[PDB]
Amino acid sequence: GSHMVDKPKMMIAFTCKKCNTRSSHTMSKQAYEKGTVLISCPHCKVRHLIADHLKIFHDHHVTVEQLMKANGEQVSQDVGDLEFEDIPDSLKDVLGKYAK
Ligand SMILES: [Zn+2]
């Protein structure tokens, strides 16, 4: 756990091959380069992974709702985008309980 004042943000447009819909999304560069980032496409109402560094969904045992419950974001129809640079310990716990 640490803190810094050098966590800028960048915009990236991705073409949704699902509904052939394109949209731009801005997220923390630190969270994207070193962390998990989720973006929702304003057409098919759905979040997609762009850069997984925390391997949160890689555990195929966590839902998008859980990730929000860990952060605090109560609203989901607000921005439809979330960034993670340092996942909690309560989450990883459920991913590391069977193996000990
Ligand atoms: Zn889409």
Side-chain angles (χ1 to χ4, degrees):
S2 305
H3 313 260
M4 289 186 145
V5 288
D6 313 311
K7 48 177 153 67
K9 47 150 74 169
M10 42 157 259
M11 206 173 297
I12 44 142
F14 103 93
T15 299
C16 207
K17 237 107 186 64
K18 287 114 75 76
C19 51
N20 310 130
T21 305
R22 205 206 204 175
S23 292
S24 15
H25 324 263
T26 328
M27 68 275 298
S28 156
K29 212 257 271 214
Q30 210 254 298
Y32 172 91
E33 278 217 346
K34 309 293 151 68
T36 314
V37 285
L38 238 60
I39 51 148
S40 154
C41 172
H43 194 88
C44 48
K45 47 179 90 78
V46 69
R47 288 77 137 180
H48 2 271
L49 168 68
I50 6 176
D52 162 69
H53 253 275
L54 304 157
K55 292 191 298 306
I56 303 164
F57 307 112
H58 185 229
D59 281 284
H60 77 113
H61 269 262
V62 68
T63 182
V64 68
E65 313 204 335
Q66 274 187 251
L67 272 90
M68 292 217 218
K69 252 104 96 218
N71 264 227
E73 274 200 352
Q74 61 187 64
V75 57
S76 324
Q77 52 165 267
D78 163 72
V79 286
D81 162 273
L82 221 168
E83 45 272 323
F84 311 95
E85 43 67 62
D86 189 43
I87 49 168
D89 179 64
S90 300
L91 288 181
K92 50 169 62 270
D93 272 329
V94 85
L95 323 172
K97 61 91 97 63
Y98 264 126
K100 183 92 261 271

